[PDB]
Amino acid sequence: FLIPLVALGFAAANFAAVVRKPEGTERMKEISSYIRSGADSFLAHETKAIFKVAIVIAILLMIFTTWQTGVAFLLGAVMSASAGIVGMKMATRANVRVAEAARTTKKIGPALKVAYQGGSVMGLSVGGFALLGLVLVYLIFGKWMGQVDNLNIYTNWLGINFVPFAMTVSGYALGCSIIAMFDRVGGGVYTKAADMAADLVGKTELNLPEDDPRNPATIADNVGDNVGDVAGLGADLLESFVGAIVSSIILASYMFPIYVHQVPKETIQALISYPIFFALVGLGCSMLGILYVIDNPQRELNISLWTSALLTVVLTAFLTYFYLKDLQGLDVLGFRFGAISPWFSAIIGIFSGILIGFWAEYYTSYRYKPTQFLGKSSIEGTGMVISNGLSLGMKSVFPPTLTLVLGILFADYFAGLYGVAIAALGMLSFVATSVSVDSYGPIADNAGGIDPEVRKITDHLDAVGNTTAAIGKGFAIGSAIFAALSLFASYMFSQISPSDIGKPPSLVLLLNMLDARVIAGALLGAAITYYFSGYLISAVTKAAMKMVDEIRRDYNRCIEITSDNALKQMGYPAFIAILTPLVTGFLLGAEFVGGVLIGTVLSGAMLAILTANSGGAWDNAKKYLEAGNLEGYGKGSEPHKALVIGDTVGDPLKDTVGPSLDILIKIMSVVSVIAVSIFKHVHLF
Amino acid sequence: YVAALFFLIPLVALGFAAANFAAVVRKPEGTERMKEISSYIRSGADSFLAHETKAIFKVAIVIAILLMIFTTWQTGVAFLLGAVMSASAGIVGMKMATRANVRVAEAARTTKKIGPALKVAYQGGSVMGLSVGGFALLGLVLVYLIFGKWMGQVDNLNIYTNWLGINFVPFAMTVSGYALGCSIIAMFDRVGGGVYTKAADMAADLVGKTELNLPEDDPRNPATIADNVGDNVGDVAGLGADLLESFVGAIVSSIILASYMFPIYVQKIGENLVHQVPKETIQALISYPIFFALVGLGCSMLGILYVIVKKPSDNPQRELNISLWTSALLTVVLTAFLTYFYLKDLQGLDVLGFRFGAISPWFSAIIGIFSGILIGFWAEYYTSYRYKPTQFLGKSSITGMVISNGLSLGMKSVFPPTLTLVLGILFADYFAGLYGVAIAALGMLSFVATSVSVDSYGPIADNAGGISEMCELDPEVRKITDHLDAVGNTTAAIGKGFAIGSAIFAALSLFASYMFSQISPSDIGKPPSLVLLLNMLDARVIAGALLGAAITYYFSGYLISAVTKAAMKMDYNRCIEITSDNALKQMGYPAFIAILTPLVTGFLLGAEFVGGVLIGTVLSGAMLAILTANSGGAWDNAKKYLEAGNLEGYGKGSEPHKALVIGDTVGDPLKDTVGPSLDILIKIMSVVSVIAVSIFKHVHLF
Ligand SMILES: [Mg+2]
Ligand SMILES: [Mg+2]
Ligand SMILES: [Mg+2]
Ligand SMILES: [Mg+2]
């Protein structure tokens, strides 16, 4: 209860504590000033865009559905934006202090503590704002208006029949989705255009030094390392977390009228509240793990993760047993082992998540065989390097997907679709620690950008941050896959109609693949996924060229130009993501859109895994060859040329395309779930 | 009866192919070193063919015996027949191209008959296409005449249950085995051949980047002879194998849909299920795809011969379009006549969903035909720099940016053909339900004879380009054949698009067939609408979709890994044979995985999971195929433009030219092995799933 406020205050306390850390060096202070100025300008531009789009969409939701939906949309927008702003400011401020600690104390410990404190500020802001928004929505709308009390399908002034509370939580999830969409897409385009331009100025005719303070592109690359790995990745994790919670709530809410009432109101109310309490326990357990951690940084991060996971396991076992022991109609909704069944699913998801990270690591890291084969092959041709990286990513897609399939099967066997959503929530129970670790990465990147012994210590922490960022990217992709699957489940429950309640519940819960509509929608969704990825790449290249032209021709000016180009190019993919469900449905019904959702989820998950793993393998092979474990091949060799080309191709892919894809899948699912009440029946063909 | 005339049409196609073979035999072939080179290529290719043919004969005999064990022996016999017919078509086309390669260059150079040499090369492609179509339809008609009519498998038309719990229609299972045979042979051909051809092209570029400096597509490299052997193996044989595989899949799926529609439509009156559709109507709907295919073959032959003797279009691509358009329109009109007669003899139109009666499947057919044409157009529009696409590729060439833009261009090109195909699906459904969806599938490849003709023309032009580069009589001598090679690359992309569109329609019909095979006598008592149900909500189905998409990407990646390993590894003829044998050995594994995945996934999780696996495989394979084909074609077409130097006089020596060559060599394995292997994967997985459903829907562990 009010645990999110504790997270917000504890995040603010770590902000105040780290501000009291000396900034030391003057050149480093100036670099942090440049990064802060550029990041704040980018914030101003994106916040103007987000304000306009969010107000428009909130008014639209208020028009077509109940006003509570639009209010929750705005609330989610505000909460996610606040979390992102607080975390990004923390990260921009903490890098120089981390460097100062590492330099003065000649030790990695104080620097590690300050960097992890900044990461914790970001993660705590995420969790606290998200869960505080959830609690405010529940307290204001569910109880004061009695939407949960009557728990009846409402018909608004446009003749749209729908569940008010489900539509409101759908709008709140849509707000999280819109914030994550703008953050990840625009920011990632910025981040990879900036890193690409930083590498390009090294290779231009003017030979402006790469990773140079006078280079505007190095400052843009640092700002992007912050914006991408913090705002976009944390936004993705919060979007998947909120999607899972909202999916559980929607599943219970629509199971109430479907099972006829075969399930009492008390059971439905408890199943709606269970993810909320389960989410709160995850936040508390995550903070406990963080507090314990605050010579091996990876060991400390792993300890934080495992403590958070195990504490969640035990406390949620107790909560789930004590709270769901007193409900009726558990078997009808799929609780095989009774009240213990959802908790089981949750822990399963937890394990799935951790395992997924390993697989990402197993393919992305150069310590293991996959990236060693890539580095060894690099002696034989740039094209062969590109082919081997593509093959490695395509091979890497399989093991995490197999893990996800096994987790889905186990969660289903335990507790139906409700426990599938609970397993998603279990995977995201330690999302606070996940966001903290992930936002650690870019602080280390910036510190690296900022004695040879202190340099090597900063390099050590930067490499640890890179590895953790790759692991977090894999984790985010897996969590987004679970969230999209649960959102599809919620959409298909939303397929319910007043005429359908008389029909068998199994007959209602029905999407035949044999339908040409379903098959064609799956095809179209997969095609739109690939077309989205292609236009992402084109936009990134265009933005990089525009920045290079401006540089040839004011660091804030160049950042503003890049931000404006990214925002202008973001409209078309955002338009596609928003309009595909609406247009496809108002033309063909809801079965076509369900097929679209299935195909989009499949294609986006697969491409995201592929791109993330390939880029991670390429970057780690670069580091492998630089450290020289491939004996007899020094810097400047043909393998280095091949790896540089491979990284320039892959880095933008792994850091914007795949995350954009999983944001795409989740937002398309959310928009379909929201619009179903209209466009199931208002369809042209 | 007139059926004798229909049976004679494939025989006429075979005879005309033999006549064109006699035409190519009259090759002067003045050049001696190039003739010896082609003889060496023929010897190596035939040795590889003998080795792979022995291995695939072993595997095919094993699989046929397995079919005889688990299901009817007619299934294995039809599988063996399809193996023989497809192998014969591939061999005939290969011999035709190998004989024609030197002849085209000889005519164009010595006799200055560049145009006539082009015409004879397209005639060789037509020989391959006629062999493909004639052998496929001859096998189909022999199967139908022997088993459906003589043995009374259609006459009794009753579901039989053998041991192991397999319930099935004997004739439907026989045609399923014949389609599975075409799929297995096409798999062995394409996977290994594509690995070999792209390893050979990559190895030629490696000799460019070895201690020597003799690159790929390069006259100075004699290692390119292995690349030429590949230009035949796969770039000729595999396109016909894939198109025949999709063609047979569409026809067999239509036949299965019609055959299982007979027991499905039953109405419970007085505790007795009355067959809602008569036997005569079902038999007519089973025979109709065969007559439509025969009419399509006849129209294709008429159009091809008419174009050869009517007008020498100065644009070879325009001439190919003229041939395609004539064949398409003739097929449309004659199928109008056929379907009007069937509508005159049909009465169960509303119960089966025929809005316009038998004309509605005809509509669907036309839809598919036009759809295919449009798809091809789109392919060109994105792969060729005639419009802004691939022009921006050259602008980017003006290296990492180039690679990124090529990837983006391929992914952009994915969307329009898929949108056109979705519109075609919607229209075919609206006309005539799933039966007309299958009819549109068959319509798209109704002119598959002309399609294979054009596509197999392509690599003959590629070989002529290599020979012209070797001759070095003039850069214009090289460029005349490079023009034809670029046309061939565009046609290969068009053929891949046709194959994937037909595969998508056929896979839709195969989902229908899978759920039809789910029928049991209890399901016959149960409502057909309730039976026809594969819920997406189901965790099994959704997880299966995820797994199928993952297997699609992992298959592509392991293909790339095997090709790269072969390139890393490499008597020069002995070395080529060793590389080819290693490629076949590594081809063995993914095929085994593809065959075993449906069986294992089902015996673990039911039939819903396997249906989901099929869904995911269809989606991912189709999308990747479109992507790879378009991207590779765009890269190669931009190469041609920069080589001619119309890009501001940069010339060969420009560093961006080297970067673009490297990018094109990267793209080649994708466009020439990944996507077509994926669509064959999709259809073979669907076929084996539909076969195994009868057991493993109810004999499942979890
Ligand atoms: Mg070549
Ligand atoms: Mg060549
Ligand atoms: Mg060639
Ligand atoms: Mg090639």
Coordinates of N, CA and C and ligand atoms in Angstrom, one line a residue, chain B residues 198 201 668 671-672, ligand 4:
Chain B
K198 N 25.9 -21.1 -54.3 CA 26.3 -19.9 -53.7 C 27.7 -20.0 -53.1
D201 N 29.9 -19.4 -56.2 CA 30.0 -18.0 -56.5 C 30.9 -17.3 -55.5
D668 N 23.7 -12.5 -52.6 CA 23.5 -13.7 -53.5 C 23.0 -14.9 -52.7
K671 N 19.1 -14.2 -51.7 CA 18.2 -14.2 -52.8 C 18.1 -15.6 -53.5
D672 N 19.2 -16.4 -53.5 CA 19.2 -17.6 -54.3 C 19.0 -18.9 -53.5
Ligands
MG4 MG 25.0 -14.9 -57.0

